[PDB]
């Protein structure tokens, strides 16, 4: 889904 937040290249939160 689109819960994952991509803050920068290669880095994300809510990646579960």
């Amino acid at each position, epitope marked *: *889904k*689109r*819960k*994952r*937040i*991509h*803050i*920068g290249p290669g*880095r994300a939160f809510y990646t579960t």
Partner: antibody
Amino acid sequence: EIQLEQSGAEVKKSGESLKISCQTSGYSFSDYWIGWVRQMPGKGLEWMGIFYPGDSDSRYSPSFEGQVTMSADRSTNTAHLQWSSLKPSDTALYYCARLGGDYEDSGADAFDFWGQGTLVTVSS
Amino acid sequence: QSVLTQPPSASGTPGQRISISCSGTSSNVENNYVYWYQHLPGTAPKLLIYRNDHRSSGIPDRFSASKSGTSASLAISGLRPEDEGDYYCAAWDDSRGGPDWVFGGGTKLTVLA
């Protein structure tokens, strides 16, 4: 076609409760974060927080923690911002926005589709 | 860390190129994605640029952006009267170990009449 539609202008007296609304159109409401943005009179845009309707997860900016409550109901595709006790300093323009962009196969990172805003005036 | 600084004001005459600067920190502009917004009278903030330097679909070629170090910047060539309004940079800030969104203080762009 994606649209967020916010509720109308509010003129309130201090201490009064208020829930303003953002109803979304054109995508799966559960699947995306909704962000909230305040603009005080004569000032710049300021981020309040984000809410995930799918599972009610949330992130609040430090200054908004405890001052306001983001919610949603998935039965109506409506995101909400609630104050039980409106203060004069809450007087502002409030925007709702979807966190999206769909730049990759997964996730999100830009506030792409915005509501038209809701003005809130509170006086004591 | 969680602060994007922009100059308050900018201006040019129709047909000129202008540049709007945005200054951040190691927790936002330097490594994280930067975005640019237009805010015109009567309308919601509008995404121009995403992830440092990509034009949002439908945005004209005369809008562009870049960043070096802790600074980012938005350029508008072929300045037109309807460009007049507020421009904001924004970035993901990771000072708290999570995704916080920060807006810069914004810059008022006047198209000189």
